[PDB]
Amino acid sequence: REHWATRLGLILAMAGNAVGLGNFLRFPVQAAENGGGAFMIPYIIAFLLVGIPLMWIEWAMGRYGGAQGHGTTPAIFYLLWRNRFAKILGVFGLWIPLVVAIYYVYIESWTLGFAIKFLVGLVPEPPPTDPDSILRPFKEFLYSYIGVPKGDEPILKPSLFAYIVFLITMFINVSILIRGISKGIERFAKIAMPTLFILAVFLVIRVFLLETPNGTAADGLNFLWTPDFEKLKDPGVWIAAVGQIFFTLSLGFGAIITYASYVRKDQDIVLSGLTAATLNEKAEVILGGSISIPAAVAFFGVANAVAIAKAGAFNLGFITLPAIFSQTAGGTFLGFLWFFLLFFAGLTSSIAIMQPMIAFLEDELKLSRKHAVLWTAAIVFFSAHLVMFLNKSLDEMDFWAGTIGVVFFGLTELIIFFWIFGADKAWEEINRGGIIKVPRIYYYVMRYITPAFLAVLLVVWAREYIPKIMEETHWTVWITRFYIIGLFLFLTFLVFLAERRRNHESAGT
Ligand SMILES: CCCCCCCCO[C@@H]1O[C@H](CO)[C@@H](O)[C@H](O)[C@H]1O
Ligand SMILES: CCCCCCCCO[C@@H]1O[C@H](CO)[C@@H](O)[C@H](O)[C@H]1O
Ligand SMILES: CCCCCCCCO[C@@H]1O[C@H](CO)[C@@H](O)[C@H](O)[C@H]1O
Ligand SMILES: CCCCCCCCO[C@@H]1O[C@H](CO)[C@@H](O)[C@H](O)[C@H]1O
Ligand SMILES: CNCCCN1c2ccccc2CCc2ccccc21
Ligand SMILES: CC(C)C[C@H](N)C(=O)O
Ligand SMILES: [Cl-]
Ligand code: NA
Ligand code: NA
């Protein structure tokens, strides 16, 4: 069994797991689209009532399972609840991270592609006034890279460069994962995190130096950090805030659990878990929130910045920011640093969502690390073609797996660990070996508050928001739904084979 060599490696690996594209690309959009400061209140509450408690729960379930040679939920859920059904529900712990990896790695490859082009200076050349004359060249740049449709058809035509970069991205992910936990994920985390931090701070510093006739970077911070209690009664903001919390902290993806399964039985998961969660939040609200938003508001003002965030989730990070940078000396290089930052941020997170499948193949099907990594890479690479060529396929996978799936799974793992397994056993398991104890009140939060909070959230969602996404979408969404449902059946079949394999082994022993 592989174990994290050092505590710093563990923290930086777990921090690398959480700190990713969600901090720098997703958070800014979610905040701006929901009133900025009006989004922060529910976000902070969601972090305290959902983020923190679930982080500890996943670290606990992981370490508990790893002690018995299991790093994924199909097996761990069964250990906590001896029921054939626990194995089915556990499949989501392999499905979610696999589906998310299918589109996450692709988006990650974009940042590598852009980074390369911006470094070499193969970027557009804007006409020397007029906002549209500045932004259009960059919009075209993105649209040509990923191949956005021009006609009436929902078909994408990625550039050859984009495709080749995706292959390289997969290769880089494999090169790290194939070396294992300590010599792969950990070695890399110790290099990537410090780099990521320096790049992020440098960018924040450069961004503040932005002052135009429309505003300053300070105006952006005020927008993001000014309370608006008139939206606290809006369910949509709460759904957005909770969704962001889950995504940014890697909760409900089965990633934290798998990583924690490599933590030694005696090791502290309380302080370690809290540190990883805190590092992510700092990287999100302080770093992530201080780059994109302040820069957009500085050049276009609050109103226009918000409109740009509402048009295309990728606008602000792949079109707007590099466009804004292009108007300053060394702006192309600054764009390179922005995309290089995103690449490392994503790379440290993509290896985390691919490890669960790898761990399952090693733990349950007894495959060698080499074979487990290559097969996982093959499944992701192949499946990724659907996201690369079918328009809005990405949007669909992100919803079922990265949005609904994670909240549902988060509630499932809590119920299984804190209700079925036992609230008092769970509590003991979480605190065992801890350098610090979990505050007493959190017992009540985990047992009553968190589950009730997520239960209400899921109910409202399925009533006033999801029916539209089941009756107001293009027919091609069914191609993606069909395929991801097939992935679930495939994983269920593997769980079944793992059962038959273990049974046969128990007879020979
Ligand atoms: C995975 C099973 C079959 C995959 C076939 C992939 C064929 C990719 O084909 C490539 O697509 C690129 C755009 O994405 C084009 O730019 C290339 O010219 C084209 O050769
Ligand atoms: C550097 C790591 C991967 C580099 C892949 C480069 C793929 C280049 O691909 C080429 O790009 C040219 C534009 O630059 C196009 O005009 C060509 O049609 C295209 O085939
Ligand atoms: C993902 C499920 C199916 C993916 C099918 C991808 C088929 C790619 O097909 C290729 O597309 C290229 C343009 O991108 C064309 O230039 C090639 O002639 C065509 O063969
Ligand atoms: C399914 C996910 C992506 C599918 C991309 C399909 C791109 C198809 O492209 C089409 O391929 C046909 C042959 O199959 C050709 O006869 C058409 O002329 C060509 O436009
Ligand atoms: C509305 N569709 C775009 C969905 C994808 N998306 C992702 C997903 C993974 C990593 C980054 C992002 C950045 C853009 C973004 C913003 C808000 C929700 C989802 C997303
Ligand atoms: C899916 C997770 C690994 C995503 C990561 N926590 C991020 O914020 O990008
Ligand atoms: Cl290109
Ligand atoms: Na994050
Ligand atoms: Na990361």
mmCIF file of C-alpha atoms and ligand atoms in Angstrom, residues 18-20 22-23 247-249 280 284, ligand 8:
data_model
loop_
_atom_site.group_PDB
_atom_site.id
_atom_site.type_symbol
_atom_site.label_atom_id
_atom_site.label_comp_id
_atom_site.label_asym_id
_atom_site.label_seq_id
_atom_site.Cartn_x
_atom_site.Cartn_y
_atom_site.Cartn_z
ATOM 1 C CA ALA A 18 -8.780 21.283 -4.434
ATOM 2 C CA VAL A 19 -7.024 24.309 -5.942
ATOM 3 C CA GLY A 20 -7.717 24.138 -9.659
ATOM 4 C CA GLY A 22 -12.626 26.050 -10.110
ATOM 5 C CA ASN A 23 -10.715 28.668 -8.157
ATOM 6 C CA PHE A 247 -16.701 21.762 -6.712
ATOM 7 C CA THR A 248 -13.836 23.862 -5.327
ATOM 8 C CA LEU A 249 -13.224 21.590 -2.332
ATOM 9 C CA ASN A 280 -8.159 26.230 -1.137
ATOM 10 C CA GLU A 284 -10.141 30.971 -4.251
HETATM 11 NA NA NA B 8 -10.770 24.489 -5.727
#
